[PDB]
Enzyme design. Structure first.
Site, PDB file in Angstrom:
ATOM      1  N   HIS A   1      16.088  34.020  59.584  1.00 60.54           N
ATOM      2  CA  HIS A   1      15.962  35.367  59.075  1.00 60.54           C
ATOM      3  C   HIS A   1      16.808  35.496  57.816  1.00 60.54           C
ATOM      4  O   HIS A   1      17.765  34.748  57.610  1.00 60.54           O
ATOM      5  CB  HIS A   1      16.437  36.393  60.104  1.00 60.54           C
ATOM      6  CG  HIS A   1      15.622  36.413  61.357  1.00 60.54           C
ATOM      7  ND1 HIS A   1      14.293  36.772  61.370  1.00 60.54           N
ATOM      8  CD2 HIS A   1      15.951  36.132  62.640  1.00 60.54           C
ATOM      9  CE1 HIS A   1      13.836  36.706  62.609  1.00 60.54           C
ATOM     10  NE2 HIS A   1      14.824  36.328  63.400  1.00 60.54           N
ATOM     11  N   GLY A   2      16.440  36.450  56.968  1.00 59.10           N
ATOM     12  CA  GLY A   2      17.208  36.655  55.751  1.00 59.10           C
ATOM     13  C   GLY A   2      16.956  38.021  55.160  1.00 59.10           C
ATOM     14  O   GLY A   2      16.105  38.786  55.619  1.00 59.10           O
TER      15      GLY A   2
ATOM     16  N   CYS B   1      13.103  35.982  54.689  1.00 61.53           N
ATOM     17  CA  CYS B   1      12.749  37.175  53.933  1.00 61.53           C
ATOM     18  C   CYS B   1      13.780  37.466  52.855  1.00 61.53           C
ATOM     19  O   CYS B   1      14.951  37.091  52.955  1.00 61.53           O
ATOM     20  CB  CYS B   1      12.656  38.398  54.836  1.00 61.53           C
ATOM     21  SG  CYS B   1      11.262  38.351  55.984  1.00 61.53           S
TER      22      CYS B   1
ATOM     23  N   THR C   1      15.039  38.429  66.735  1.00 59.74           N
ATOM     24  CA  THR C   1      14.032  37.771  67.551  1.00 59.74           C
ATOM     25  C   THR C   1      13.971  36.281  67.247  1.00 59.74           C
ATOM     26  O   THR C   1      14.331  35.824  66.156  1.00 59.74           O
ATOM     27  CB  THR C   1      12.654  38.388  67.320  1.00 59.74           C
ATOM     28  OG1 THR C   1      12.286  38.235  65.944  1.00 59.74           O
ATOM     29  CG2 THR C   1      12.659  39.855  67.683  1.00 59.74           C
ATOM     30  N   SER C   2      13.508  35.521  68.227  1.00 59.32           N
ATOM     31  CA  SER C   2      13.357  34.085  68.046  1.00 59.32           C
ATOM     32  C   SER C   2      12.233  33.796  67.061  1.00 59.32           C
ATOM     33  O   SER C   2      11.211  34.487  67.039  1.00 59.32           O
ATOM     34  CB  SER C   2      13.081  33.408  69.388  1.00 59.32           C
ATOM     35  OG  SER C   2      14.178  33.591  70.264  1.00 59.32           O
TER      36      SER C   2
END
Lengths: 5, 146, 95
Positions: B93-94, B135, B34-35
């Site tokens: 993201h991560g 994350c 997701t954006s």
């Protein structure tokens, strides 16, 4: 709004 | 001269150094990611903050995993001799040990290895700061009332 | 005569190992909001680890998630300062 990564 | 101490990094080189900001907001549809609404506020906040610290800020938006590696490789091959330090900010993201390009993951070790003391000699002995908004897993902190 | 190849790195992680990291659609991520605010206030007067410690306190105390999904509601975050630095870091110097 909170939303996470 | 008088007594000299060696307790703090020399930060009075001609330049403070680069501040690379990788701002990944929009991911390839293929990935299902997701954006990241709000990340442009972060990227602008960081640009202004490090501008006031006299860093040469370079903002990069929506990089693939290949582009992240190429960017880091190229930056690590610059001559940092006149720079006090190096800053890299990753917004994406991560997972634990991982940051996402727009088309899949990058190991954080792959990114930071370019700047190892033996691989980026003009940053040897200089502080190399990696600031990571991502994350690191799926655990939730329920907190405790104080 | 040598230093470790891993020396002189600092990793300012937004969250503890294993944990989610929270982001607000209007204000940005909790961590980056707080990092920028503390650098703005203290970069001309505190050593970097002490700035980052204020960031830890700000994230820990001033933020809590709000979610329509009870699974993700009322959650907290602590950032994670990982220092392999060998010296104190001040962003300012003596003229």
């Amino acid at each position: 709004x909170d939303x996470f990564x | 001269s008088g007594i000299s101490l060696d307790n703090s990094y020399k930060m009075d080189y001609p330049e403070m150094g680069l501040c690379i900001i990788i701002n990944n907001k929009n991911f390839h549809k293929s990935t299902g990611m997701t954006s990241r609404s709000g990340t442009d506020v972060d990227a602008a906040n960081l640009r202004e903050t490090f501008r006031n610290l006299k860093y040469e800020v370079r903002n990069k938006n929506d990089l693939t995993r290949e582009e992240i590696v190429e960017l880091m490789r190229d930056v690590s091959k610059e001559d940092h001799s006149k720079r006090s330090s190096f800053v890299c900010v990753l917004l994406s993201h991560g997972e634990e040990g991982i940051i996402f390009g727009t088309n899949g993951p990058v190991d954080l070790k792959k990114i930071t290895n370019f700047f190892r003391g033996d691989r980026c000699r003009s940053l040897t002995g200089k502080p190399k700061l990696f600031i990571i908004q991502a994350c690191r897993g799926t655990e939730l902190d329920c907190g405790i009332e104080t | 005569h040598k230093i470790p190849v891993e020396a002189d790195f600092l990793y300012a992680y937004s969250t503890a190992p294993g944990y989610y990291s929270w982001r607000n659609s209007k204000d940005g991520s909790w961590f980056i909001q707080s990092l920028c605010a503390m650098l703005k206030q203290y970069a001309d007067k505190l050593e970097f680890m002490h700035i980052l410690t204020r960031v830890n306190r700000k994230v820990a105390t001033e933020f809590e998630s709000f979610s329509f999904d009870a699974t993700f509601h009322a959650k907290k975050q602590i950032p994670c300062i990982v220092s392999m630095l060998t010296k104190e870091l001040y962003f300012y110097h003596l003229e």
